[model samples]
Every structure is written in C-alpha cells, then in structure tokens.
Target: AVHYQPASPPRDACVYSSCYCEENVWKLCEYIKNHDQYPLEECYAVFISNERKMIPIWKQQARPGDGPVIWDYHVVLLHVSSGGQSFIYDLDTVLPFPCLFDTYVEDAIKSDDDIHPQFRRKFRVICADSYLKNFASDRSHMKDSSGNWREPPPPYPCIETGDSKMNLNDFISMDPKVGWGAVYTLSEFTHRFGS
Candidate 1:
C-alpha cells in the first residue's frame, strides 16, 4: 500500500495526565487495541530512555518554548497502519495528540547528535499485543525513601498483569538484551518508526 497520512484523531479521545506518560500510553494502547477505529496488530508501545536514564525531549508542558526537558523516561504509542503512514500518540507532550511520525521525530525528538551521550535517547519497541499482555506497574517507583509520593499518581488504579506488578523498568531500560522488545537508538528509531 502507498504511504499516506492519517488525519489526526480527536485529542479528547485520549486519556492522559501531566506526568503519567507510561500509564497514559497504556491507555492509548488499550484505546487502539479495543476501539473499533484502530486495529490492535498495527499499534506499538515505545519506551524512550537511554542507558544513563537521561533523555531530552522538546515541546513539553512543564518547560516552555523550544527548549528540551530532560525526562528519565517517556512512553508513547505508535500506529503503523496498512496505509503505510505511522502515527504517534504522545498525550502529555505539547505536540499534537496523534502526530505524523516524521513530524513527531523532527520537531519533538530532534537529533541527538550534539547532545551529551547521557542525553541521547533510545527506544524499546513492543508490539501493542505484547505490551498489553506483559506490561505492569505498581507505582512504587514514584515513592520516596519515606514512602511518600514523589509526584501525584494517575487517578486510575495501578496497572497489574500476570504475576508482575512493577516491571516497568524492563520496558524503560534500553538494554537490547534486557526486555521483551527491540531496542534502538534515536537514529534507528527515527528510521524504523518514521516510515
């Protein structure tokens, strides 16, 4: 099939929060998986981070202008439709809700060439079905030494799947051999996911 752009889906259709990219993305995966408008097999779960856990992303609400925000990790959902176009959903990012893959990469992810190695991002790409079936989080990573919440958790209850409750690290970690998904560098991700 020839590649073509898919019109943006209504932003309000996505469930999200300011700091819950992972959970928000999980919801997005569910949306694309269960919603009649999208096919489950065409979607992917992408976890963005580097070995050092420092990655710079642009157009974040917490930081104004074109400046980059350093996130330890971020999550997004990618839809590679049969039409050959790819759409990426970044719920909390200042970018469009479902942005075209090329535009999303150029404007939001940018090139990591000049950034410090620690700030260069990598991607762990998991098929939506696998991600939906395997991913889990208990919110323990958000607490402080005193067990106080570091940031407000998503209003939704914690995600649990199978026997694991807090395996988010497996998704976030960029080690090629560490997780259930394929790991790629920024350039590799750009080329692979950009279409």
Candidate 2:
C-alpha cells in the first residue's frame, strides 16, 4: 500500500493555523499502502518541482470560508513490485500520467534552458534497507572508447543510478517549492491511484 502525509514543519502537532502543517495535509503514503496500491515493502516520495521554470505552487492555506486552492499539479508515478518495494517518479516536464513510465517519454514533454535530450526527468526515491530496498539507474548501456562501462546502470527501473550527490541536490532543490508538502500515508493516494 502507498501512503502520504502533508509535511509538518518542525512544529507542534496542534498548531493547525494552516494546511501546510503535518496534520492537515493529506497522508498519501499511508493511503497507498493500506489500499494495497504499492504493498508494504518499499515506498518513497517523488518530489517534482518546476522550480527551473518558476511555476507557481498550489497553496493550501486555510481561509475563513474559502476552500483550499489546488493547482493542476504534475502526476506522481508510483511503481510497485512483487518484492514489496515501491518507486515514485516525479516528472517535472509536465506530461500527463497513464504514460509508459520511461525516461525518454519524460524528456519529450520538457521545454527548458538546460533541458538535455539525454537529461530525463527522475523519480527521487529514498530506499530503506529494512524493506530490502535497492536502487537502479536508466538503461543507457553505453561504453567508453576502451570498451569500459561509460555510465553505471540502474539496479531497477525508475530508480536513478548516478552520482548520489547529484540526486540529493535534485531532491533538495525541488523540496522547498513543493505545494502539497510531503505525502506520507495510504489514504491520501487512494483517489489518484484509481483509473
């Protein structure tokens, strides 16, 4: 199952002045797991921010009589395996879901300054060893001039296989601008998972 929780700033639980806090935000991670969307083994959050494009975020602040404002946000692809692990793909290129779930497919929708035909969008996954978690990279299978491995391949699809430092930077850069905050529960993703 997959689940999510709106992120709570490092503040008290009762402090519910706004929807950005941990309590009020939807717990998507938990929702996915309980509903058996991704099983119970490996689960992660895919943070996608068009920060490179400076797109505005969906604000969830509370108002006297108004509902929270939601944006046409990007789709977060949740990939699960029989082994009980889950992978999340956050394509910042702004393509719709029901996609084939490939890096090449993701790059086609992108329009930006630094966009690389080879630079595909990623699903930032943090694995937990207790869950038998593993990571992998895209399958380029390129070789150097000397027949040496040019780039390491992913252990599995949807899991990035590259410099850990680059991946960490990618995750952090998009985090602060996230509108929905962090999703950490199963119920939160139930509606989205259904076709």
Candidate 3:
C-alpha cells in the first residue's frame, strides 16, 4: 500500500514557491523511482492554475484582510499507486503529507462562491520528466549582463525540511527576494521552450 509522509523540511533558502514546489516534487519522484523502485511512468509534476478563480480555501486559512487571495498559479506532484489510486503531494499545504487527489480538489473548491466550470477545467497536470528535460532556467530575466543570477538559484541539491511549518499563505506572500511568482499555464510553459 502506498503511504503518505510529510517531506523532509526544506532548506531555509529553498523554501520559496518555485524552488520548494518543483524541486520537492522532483526529489520525491526521484525517490519513488530510484529508492522505492516504482515505475517513473506513474510519477508526475502537476501545474494547477485558474486565472479567474480565487482560491477561497487560501483566504479562509490565510485570513488576510488585504493582498491576493489566489495565487496566479500553483504546482504540485501527482503519484499514481500500483492499485490505480492517485495522490497529491503539496509541500506547502496544511496537510501533514500527501492526500487523495479527489479530497484535495474537493477541499480546494468546497466554497460555493469559488465553484466555476473554468475552475474545474483549469487544472493542467503534466509529467515532471518532460518539464525537466525541456525547460532550462537561463536566469535571463532575473540576471544582469554579468550572467550572475540576480537572485542566485537555490542550493545545488535543494535542502529537505522534514516537515515545513510554513503554510500556504506564507508561500503566497513570499518576499520577491526569495524568488518570483511562477505564473504560466502549461501551454505558456510549453510555448516558452518551443516544445
């Protein structure tokens, strides 16, 4: 049976959105494929977003009087067990560990006001392998002519925090000094890489 456990705590420097979300999922997928000997075929990095839908669950938990409720975008990992059930691995969420995808989605869209057809249809989950293989961060946008990353990339191998104390809101409000927001639909992402 597949088991869920909170990921190791991330490095203080690596705890922001893009680094935390993408690297954690990549590491987890690598562990499952390498250590656990699961087929790589079933592991994936998923990107979920809704340009119009404001994630109500975030506001309820964040309780922010002002500031953006829903992020422009978000990402997570999806792993399918041998038994054919799927789970979502979101490091920044309140859940202690991975959860059933259905449960996660239901919770995300539970609020009546947040429900919309576009919200349901907005998610675009893609394989992490494809992304890693195709996308290379040139650091062009964030870098100057010196070629030094204006905001240096996270630690070489990403630090693993066993259990992150930071919540979703903390992630959303992350200082720009750490990293910029990841705002791209799957199509936009693909187009950028000329895929």
- lDDT of each candidate versus the true structure: 0.81, 0.30, 0.47
lDDT of 2 by residue, 124-193 (tens): 2332221112222222223566876554432323333343211223332434442222432222233233
lDDT over C-alpha atoms for residue 111 of model 2: 31
Q: Rank the candidates by TM-score, best first.
A: 1, 3, 2
TM-score list, all predictions: 0.91, 0.29, 0.53
- Give the higher-TM-score candidate: 1 or 2: 1
Supply candidate 2's per-residue lDDT for 83.
36
Clashes of each: 0, 40, 6
Off by over 4 Å in 2: 1-26, 50-77, 82-98, 107-123, 127-195
Query: Any idea what lDDT model 2 has?
Result: 0.30
Candidate 1 lDDT (Cα, 0 to 1):
0.81
RMSD of 2: 16.2
For residues 5-63, could you state the per-residue lDDT of candidate 1 as single tens digits? 33234667567666678888788777666667667888888999888888888987778
lDDT per residue (tens digit) for residues 115-173 in model 3: 45454323444465554443233223445787666555656543333343222332232
TM-score of candidate 3 against the unseen true structure: 0.53
Q: What is candidate 2's CA lDDT for residue 65?
A: 27
